[PDB]
Write a protein that binds this ligand. Structure first.
Ligand SMILES: [Cl-]
Ligand SMILES: [Fe+3]
Ligand SMILES: [Fe+3]
Ligand SMILES: [O-]
Length: 471
């Protein structure tokens, strides 16, 4: 082992190596303060990336999380990679950041960076109510990887953004989720993640915004960014898995109990300590709509310049069958006109945020379809659905207006009186919270969630995924 593991020959740039070694103790201070509560002396069975070979790239073993081997890993550098979109299509990719784009790319990197520790800060208390050792370990695995994502971006800042990059790396540790004076940059990352149902939805829906922002940055003309993100997407895949199967196992458990009691009635299901499917639907509505705001205004001149200038491409840019310049292309978006929601066509360049939002909607929907297999398998009519994209939005054309899940423009009064049916109430949040009792004995699961289909790294489900050191 080296002090900072990496596949970018950090060793051979002494100035850069020392700058990051200077930042490391500060990162570790942040981990000890805002990382998982009371965990400094736990041994956790964790995956650690040591390399990038797709055949095997990650060690498994017990480690105390303070000692986790956070490292910098980029996808391998391609020979003569060309810029695939925008005014610079056809030219060589960039190894350094051009002056004209320096501050724009900095803000992109910093904003992506900021969401990483924000997630850990939002989730630091969750361990104390973990429904199983398996689940606690998953939480911790997500947490250390979000840590590594902070390292991924701070590396770029130090390596390619000089003085202010150094300053940005500091400031990334000084802002704090929900803080009054130094809050994190985006609204979704200052929200409470108050329980494990929210956590699974977060990693299912909001980490998915991560997926799509990263996939777009993975196309970037700025190739060190591109390569950082390509790898990060592999990590994000694990986070989405935790979320999707989290909720699946909760739905499984609720369905088991609906069959077992021969009933549908929320009151009865809640007497038995499960989360009724309609309440789950409200949580889906909440996280979905709040996350949708992160993609930005549907129509936006800034997104257009990030494409044209080669900074940020579309999701799976190279598969799309067009000119990859888009000056003469169109895209269909919605439009609020009077008391009706219509559609119209706009220049493709101005609707890139909406395209990426639409791509993310599709991906979330495929997951909702998979969840719906469960009640179908039980012969139940219940289906999860996604609300109309304008529902419960604070960013974009729907910001100053209200839309029901089924896509009706509704008055302020209707919203006030009906939204208790569509988003979690205090009562619903208190009920879900009341089920959150920790359960730490090997192979056992809190009554509100089912056992997973399998373990981790081929260990059995009743493996001792976390040792606390009493035993
Ligand atoms: Cl109104
Ligand atoms: Fe991340
Ligand atoms: Fe993530
Ligand atoms: O992530």
């Amino acid at each position: 082992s080296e002090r900072i593991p990496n596949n970018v020959n950090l060793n051979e740039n002494k100035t850069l190596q020392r700058a990051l070694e200077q930042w490391q103790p500060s990162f570790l201070n942040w981990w000890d303060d805002m990382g998982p509560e009371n965990s400094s002396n736990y041994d956790v069975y964790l995956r650690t990336a040591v390399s990038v070979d797709p055949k095997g790239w990650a060690d498994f073993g017990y480690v105390k999380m303070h000692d986790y081997r956070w490292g910098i890993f980029l996808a391998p550098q391609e020979g003569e990679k060309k810029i695939t979109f925008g005014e610079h299509k056809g030219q060589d990719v960039w190894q350094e950041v051009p002056g004209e784009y320096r501050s724009t790319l900095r803000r992109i990197i910093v904003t992506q960076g900021d969401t990483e520790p924000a997630s850990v800060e939002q989730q630091r208390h969750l361990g104390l109510t973990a429904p199983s050792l398996y689940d606690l370990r998953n939480l911790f695995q997500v947490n250390v990887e979000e840590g590594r994502h902070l390292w991924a971006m701070v590396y770029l800042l130090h390596a390619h953004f000089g003085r202010d990059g150094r300053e940005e790396g500091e400031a990334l540790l000084e802002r704090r989720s929900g803080d009054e004076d130094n809050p994190r940059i985006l609204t979704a990352f200052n929200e409470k993640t108050p329980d494990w149902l929210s956590f699974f939805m977060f990693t299912f829906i909001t980490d998915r915004d991560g997926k799509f922002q990263l996939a777009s940055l993975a196309e970037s003309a700025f190739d060190p960014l591109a390569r950082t993100c390509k790898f990060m997407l592999t990590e994000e895949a694990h986070h989405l898995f935790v979320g999707e199967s989290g909720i699946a196992r909760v739905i499984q458990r609720t369905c088991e109990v609906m069959k077992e009691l021969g009933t549908d009635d929320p009151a009865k299901l809640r007497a038995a300590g499960v989360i009724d499917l309609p309440t789950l639907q409200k949580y889906l509505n909440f996280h979905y709509s709040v996350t949708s705001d992160l993609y930005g205004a549907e129509i936006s001149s800034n997104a257009a310049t990030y494409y044209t200038n080669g900074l940020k491409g579309r999701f799976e840019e190279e598969k799309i069958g067009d000119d990859h310049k888009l000056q003469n292309s169109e895209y269909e978006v919605m439009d609020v006109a009077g008391d009706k929601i219509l559609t119209r066509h706009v220049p493709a360049l101005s609707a890139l945020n909406e395209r990426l939002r639409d791509d993310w909607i599709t991906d979330v929907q495929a997951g909702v379809d998979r969840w719906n297999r469960i009640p179908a398998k039980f012969g139940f009519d219940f289906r999860f659905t996604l609300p109309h994209k304008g529902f419960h939005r604070k960013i974009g054309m729907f910001a100053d207006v209200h839309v029901s899940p089924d896509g009706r423009l509704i008055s302020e009064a209707e919203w006030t009186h009906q939204h208790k049916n569509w988003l979690p109430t205090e009562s619903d949040r208190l009920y879900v919270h009341s089920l959150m009792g920790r359960c730490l004995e090997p192979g056992k699961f809190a009554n509100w969630i089912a056992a997973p289909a399998r373990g981790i790294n081929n260990q059995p489900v009743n493996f001792e995924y976390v040792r606390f050191n009493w035993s």
